[PDB]
Amino acid sequence: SLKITKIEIFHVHTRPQSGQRPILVKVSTDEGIYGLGEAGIAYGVGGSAAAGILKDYAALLIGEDPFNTEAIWEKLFKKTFWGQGGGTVIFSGISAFDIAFWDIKGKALNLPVYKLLGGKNREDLRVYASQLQFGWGKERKSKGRKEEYAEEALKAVAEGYDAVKVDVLAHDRNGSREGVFLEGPLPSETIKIGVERVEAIRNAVGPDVDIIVENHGHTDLVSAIQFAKAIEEFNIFFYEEINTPLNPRLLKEAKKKIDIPLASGERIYSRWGFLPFLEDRSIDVIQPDLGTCGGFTEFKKIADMAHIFEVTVQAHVAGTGVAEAASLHAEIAIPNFCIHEHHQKTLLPEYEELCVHNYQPVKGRYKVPELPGIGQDITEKLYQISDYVSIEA
Amino acid sequence: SLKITKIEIFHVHTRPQSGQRPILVKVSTDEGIYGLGEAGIAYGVGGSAAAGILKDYAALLIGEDPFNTEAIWEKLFKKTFWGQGGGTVIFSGISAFDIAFWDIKGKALNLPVYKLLGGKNREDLRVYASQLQFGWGKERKSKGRKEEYAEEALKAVAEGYDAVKVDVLAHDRNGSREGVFLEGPLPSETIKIGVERVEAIRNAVGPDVDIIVENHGHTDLVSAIQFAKAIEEFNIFFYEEINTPLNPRLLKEAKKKIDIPLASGERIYSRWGFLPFLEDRSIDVIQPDLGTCGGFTEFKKIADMAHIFEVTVQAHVAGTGVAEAASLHAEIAIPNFCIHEHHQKTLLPEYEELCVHNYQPVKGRYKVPELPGIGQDITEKLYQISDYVSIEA
Amino acid sequence: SLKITKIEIFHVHTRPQSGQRPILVKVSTDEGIYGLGEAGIAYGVGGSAAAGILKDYAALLIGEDPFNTEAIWEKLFKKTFWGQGGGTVIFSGISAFDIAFWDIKGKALNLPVYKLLGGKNREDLRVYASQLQFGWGKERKSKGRKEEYAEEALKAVAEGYDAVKVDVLAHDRNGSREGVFLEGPLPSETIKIGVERVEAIRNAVGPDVDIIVENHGHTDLVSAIQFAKAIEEFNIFFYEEINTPLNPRLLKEAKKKIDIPLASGERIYSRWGFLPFLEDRSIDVIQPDLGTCGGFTEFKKIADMAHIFEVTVQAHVAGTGVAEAASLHAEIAIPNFCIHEHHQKTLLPEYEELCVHNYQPVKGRYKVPELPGIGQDITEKLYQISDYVSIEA
Amino acid sequence: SLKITKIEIFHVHTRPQSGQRPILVKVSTDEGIYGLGEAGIAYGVGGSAAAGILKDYAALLIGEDPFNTEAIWEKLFKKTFWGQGGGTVIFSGISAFDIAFWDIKGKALNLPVYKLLGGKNREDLRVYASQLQFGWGKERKSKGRKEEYAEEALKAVAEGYDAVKVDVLAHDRNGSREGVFLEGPLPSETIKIGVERVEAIRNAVGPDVDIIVENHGHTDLVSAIQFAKAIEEFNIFFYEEINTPLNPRLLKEAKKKIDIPLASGERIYSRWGFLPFLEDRSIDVIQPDLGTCGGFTEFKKIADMAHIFEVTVQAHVAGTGVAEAASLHAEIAIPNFCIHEHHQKTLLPEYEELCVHNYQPVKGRYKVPELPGIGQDITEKLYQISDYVSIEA
Amino acid sequence: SLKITKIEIFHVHTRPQSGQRPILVKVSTDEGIYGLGEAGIAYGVGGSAAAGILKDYAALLIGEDPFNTEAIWEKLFKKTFWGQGGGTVIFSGISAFDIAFWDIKGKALNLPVYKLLGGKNREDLRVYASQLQFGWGKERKSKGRKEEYAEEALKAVAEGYDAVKVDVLAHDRNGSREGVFLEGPLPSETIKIGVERVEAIRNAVGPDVDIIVENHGHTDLVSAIQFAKAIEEFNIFFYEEINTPLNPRLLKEAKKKIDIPLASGERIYSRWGFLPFLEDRSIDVIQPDLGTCGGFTEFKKIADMAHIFEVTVQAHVAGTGVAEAASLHAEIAIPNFCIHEHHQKTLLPEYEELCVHNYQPVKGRYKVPELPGIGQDITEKLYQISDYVSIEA
Ligand SMILES: [Cl-]
Ligand SMILES: [Cl-]
Ligand SMILES: [Cl-]
Ligand SMILES: [Mg+2]
Ligand SMILES: [Mg+2]
Ligand SMILES: [Mg+2]
Ligand SMILES: [Mg+2]
Ligand SMILES: [Mg+2]
């Protein structure tokens, strides 16, 4: 019965500490039910392109029935022209709408989204404390000294996390990115900086806390192999984004010389994006972002394909409470779940103020929301602190 | 929440003129909502195994929540031991229950199942008239002379079908399977018999009615290629089950020498079954059966994977109205739908008396049921004409 | 030395006949020299995303030296985060700025851009008349009857073109896209519509006018193969965008069964996008758009790589005179040039009014502009008929 | 001129300690000779399906000559329809009948089955003590403490076994499966539990007793590789069922990382099942079960193919004395035999009461039974403690 | 407007200490602007062939516009016949002229060549001291005793280099090449010679000076693997020219059993030469020589292709100041630069006297020349100490 009547797009003004700008969409229907979604380009450079694609796709969606998520997905894929060429922004547009549609379906049926995605596969979700190099962390500040890495890890363990993730190569010993270059064979001292940080954490947290190493795509396969050799002895849980994902075969080549499990996904989009990595079996833990991979509809398809290849899933989660709530539904509903990412940015007040619920882990575990829909909404403030665009018929 | 309280399995007694024995399952819950499913082993030899697998799986399912379709599928896959070895019977067990679970979800939410599978991708479904060699099709009788093949095709066209399917190799000119053997290089006269039948049909129906050729796995790659060469000139729509699917690479070898699109699926099960054929891109139209491929849950995963490879889908449909109703929901909910199989057996009173609703095409088109759930139920007669097993707490 | 002081972005208001919205960028320097570029998303759905990416990238570019095209390209690729994930909009942003930078270089050195790209490889360029199905063509109007396809081809041949391109599958016999669906095996009547149009064209123009068939990615590999079989007898020059380019291996599968040379590239971006197609040798003529592939800098890299594989190049050209002027420099400067696309849209006044020079073929031949830079500028009107964004300094 | 006149199927009632339900078949002939076979689904979930398949196949077998084992195998493969789709239950049905037919042949000719399979290749068979985690003896009790694993190993060594097999991951330190999950990257403590058990056993038994590690398909590629790293220092003889065998390429991927010889077979069926593993050379020791792989006929074909690839064989043995007696014939008759699997579960009263003869190793060595046929029979008790089905003529 | 009017070729007489004979080309135009280039065959046996190819190519070049570098490259490739067969001498001829043409372009536009190649990617270039085994300084002398290898490394470190390259296998302990044979499995004593030299250098320079090992193609894959095993513990930066490059697959085989990054390129020419190594991903650092790979034009294409594969570039540099000056422009203008080779020969007076500027690193860093053109010229002496050939209209 439902028809989309209004689409509102919020390109949120710069968040002071992080410098980031989340992009949210509110999709309203004739019956007054609305849904929230998020485009997963809150950080880096390109958020205005996400706000733009959402505006353009909106014209094709007014009048549509939000229950028709398969047909709408395929329409944005096949009828936009650019859908068939793919891309970060193209897929973020499809994703944000898809999330909002599933939010609507949940509300329309009086059920949490995970009940519409195939139910629960576990009672709760293991969580890791993500991006310790920026502090754990209501004050965001990049860390340079090895004792600071250990300290931030200890703060997370004190809160009950039994896993942490850290980028140990990005910053020099002053905590600056300035002059740090990580492609090709690395100097001994750069390797030493990474190793001393991993070692300081491992010593501090002991053997029963897992450590994930994040390279942020700053390395390439040559430097990634070199660094893995140096940190292997520390029992690394997995090794994330070790190069550029645009020539997929290179990760298979990296894996030939790296024994640590490999992870990637935040810059790989749709079934088509993940396919070559699965064919190569070069990724052990995939990390699709609901807000870029294609939404709930596509995340499920990616995870389901990945299961055939004995690959597990950790959703990439790095924006507002809309993104984070949504991720919990997607992860609880798949059998092949690894671990949940809990980003340090969620601990900053600039992010906390955006949503009505601040879902936080308890003793390092997350439970899925049990409200109808995704279980999240934006605050009334949002209109006033965003570039705002409204589309109707 | 919702819990399974009772499971009833009906291994239906021999259907007089088809010789078949459908296997249905009724899953009851603590809220009085029940679901119907079907195991796709109604013909050939093995129905009692399907009845037996359902009985064994039932022990694991009493007390479960039918909304947890993902977890239950994974439990039957991973906790039975044999799930991980796979197979016709193993997957038919998972399938029949999965269908009944989705029926339950639809009834619980007062929605047709297609609304829970992602909505409609089209307003109706193109249908073909299947298995003309048995007559179209109120009486089942094998055809021998080429004019009989033309006549049955015309009977279909008169009902408004614009596509037909025929097995032209299975029967000799007297309509007998006796002494017919179709592996290895074929006699000229066997080629001639097949060609004369396709030719008679094509001449009768004209260019605008599609002709699908069914080999029923009676051929192997050698005889399949030899026959394809002889019938290519007749514009064959696709060419189904041309060999044994147990060594998948053989179909890739077949495709090297066959220009006609290839179809298969009724004897290929789960994502894991279809994977090699997709990797080889050797099937143009996959034909999973809901009742053997793993139910709605797995059908969707198969179809969604197939989409990546520009492969389209026609559900294999060859049992009761429970199977047929369920297939309509699965097909309308996918973007990459090809055509729907309407089997001649449904036209027989043996089968019609099993189910409450008799869904039939109108002018060669099917519409999905709009009732809650799959839109089908079993008649009162079923308890009296089945081997009946009931499992409770 | 040279520093970028200002960036202006023009998202041009809807063009009436075509419904399109070009996106232009003007980059100004501290020496008063400015350059023009264009993002190649003027048609389909997503122009606002291109406007948005240009705005976001502009922040990284103020103060940069436009001669540093390599470092700026790598910066936008490696320092934006999303650069390394790729995509239509991501690469369109890099492309538009890159074109403007080369325009600046040419003006600064008082040379046409081709002199900075390695000089002329030929004195002029062979051209085809592109998109006959919309009319050749100061009035845009989709054609339905086969005689109309012949008529439009003759109009082109009368202007001295010895090659034409037509999409013969997209429209029904009424000139309408409504209800036309071209994935999976095709009905005989759809094949007949396509065939009769190719045939009518070939009969009208004779043997010495080449015919390119454009599928616009509406087909998939199955329908593409079926159609190629039907038209091969008409000596098709090449066969463009026959499926979705997101799973590259599928084009290799298509080539196995298609004798006609294959073309693609308007929805493939960067060296990374073309690589798998070259690895498979599945494309005979690549068609990168300067405004999406990565600009002059990357177009050259794509073409140079393609040469190793005995692949030739026709730039995809389908926007304003900025895009068209730019493409002439890129094409004259490469050894492996095939033919130049001259789009019917350039014939419409809504496009004519946007630029200072209206470069048009003479006797089916293009000459490269000989003015400083790309040899093109926007009109004063542009500010008044665009969504306008200015970024300083 | 033997003709099958009667087939009796015994689905044995729950065995109290093991929880298992063996499935036996007795095939009688016109001349009074009968044969015994067993379907290898006695454990896990699915035994009723094996009972059902045997009932269905039985109809095709009345009147056949038991000497025509090749034709009968091919008939059940090719004329049942589901034969060509394969599977655990499908092949278990073929298997059990085949074993009974060879039993008949041996009785008819006054020869043990090994004489009809090509004779002895050795005078006796090396044996390992299997499944120490449930105790070495005939009280079934799952072990949790590392000392208990060593104690059980020493009990076997005391009986003269020079090889043991243990699953060291399945149980927590209290001996429970509850909450144990072994897919994806494993916690350090789970690794430690496995290691401490292997190390306890190694230290106890010394260097000249071999240790096989059984993962029971509870792990996947990722966890299997991780665990192999931790135990490789202990000289593991081979490493069994390390993942799910349904995507065979994954075992090749595992072997890239894992230096310990790999074994699998109990969930892989027929020549067709083993083929991809042999093509990849990913299994060093294959473990087909006579009662699921296709019987003596197919076991021989599998073992003979495996010999080409320098792969050796250990029959999977885990049901009644029928299965155990049969396995000894199959193994002594092949050149490429590795080792025989033994449990003492065999000589529980619940299992020992089923069969006339109790074949047991002596000082870690087995002799093949030297009686006509397989050298085994069922007791009179069986009729009374089984679901009994009889099919006649 | 420019036309080539005169070509002069200087095959320089034997340089006393090195024994080498550089080959230089001076290309003059009607406007009086001239350009200098160099063929990269100054050492080994074949320089007279380089002089001869330049003489032959010169005939095709009189009257050409040196701005037409793409067309001229393609003309020498496609119109000489032997261009399409390839080769050291064939490509050296194209190379030397290409360098001279770019020199002319820079001069004609008052800009350094790097400004015409896409600008700077960095402000300076890291340098290594190359070929320590011949002495680091003004007197060339082959080293035999391990202490001498350390001594030479220390002399480099004292001048501010943080990287060195050495061939440790070429010479026996008395500093002789005679009787040294390095193909096939090596004697222990030869391994010990190489090891003791690497160890002496590592001990002398510490961890923060990188060590490159040069095999000069004297080894093959067997000895290369053997030696890598022995030196892996010394943290070798990369491992250069480890076999013969004429069967490219062999380097892929070597990489399977070598963990040190591999380098090659001075005996690999054009995009076509590097292609198979990139396809195999067997080279981590490519080392094309501007004077053999095809000049600036082709170096850029090689480096750009290499970038797709996460391969970095160090120009091979080993003749006069013409070659070295040219190399700095090529390297600063690419994003994927590794390190610059600074050859000990440049420290000899025989080489210094050939060119007007002696560009030398400062504290181990190079800056690109900023003069117009390549920033280098020959002395007027050169006519008198060369075999001189002049070609005019
Ligand atoms: Cl994009
Ligand atoms: Cl089965
Ligand atoms: Cl040569
Ligand atoms: Mg990350
Ligand atoms: Mg069929
Ligand atoms: Mg096009
Ligand atoms: Mg086992
Ligand atoms: Mg060298």
Short mmCIF file of C-alpha atoms and ligand atoms in Angstrom, two decimals, chain A residues 131 165 214 216 240-241 266 316, ligand 4:
data_model
loop_
_atom_site.label_atom_id
_atom_site.label_comp_id
_atom_site.label_asym_id
_atom_site.label_seq_id
_atom_site.Cartn_x
_atom_site.Cartn_y
_atom_site.Cartn_z
CA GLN A 131 41.25 2.90 15.80
CA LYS A 165 42.35 -2.52 16.17
CA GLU A 214 44.87 -1.68 10.08
CA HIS A 216 44.28 1.94 5.73
CA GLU A 240 43.26 -4.98 7.17
CA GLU A 241 43.40 -3.00 3.90
CA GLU A 266 35.16 -0.74 3.08
CA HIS A 316 32.69 -1.75 8.32
MG MG F 4 39.49 0.33 7.79
#
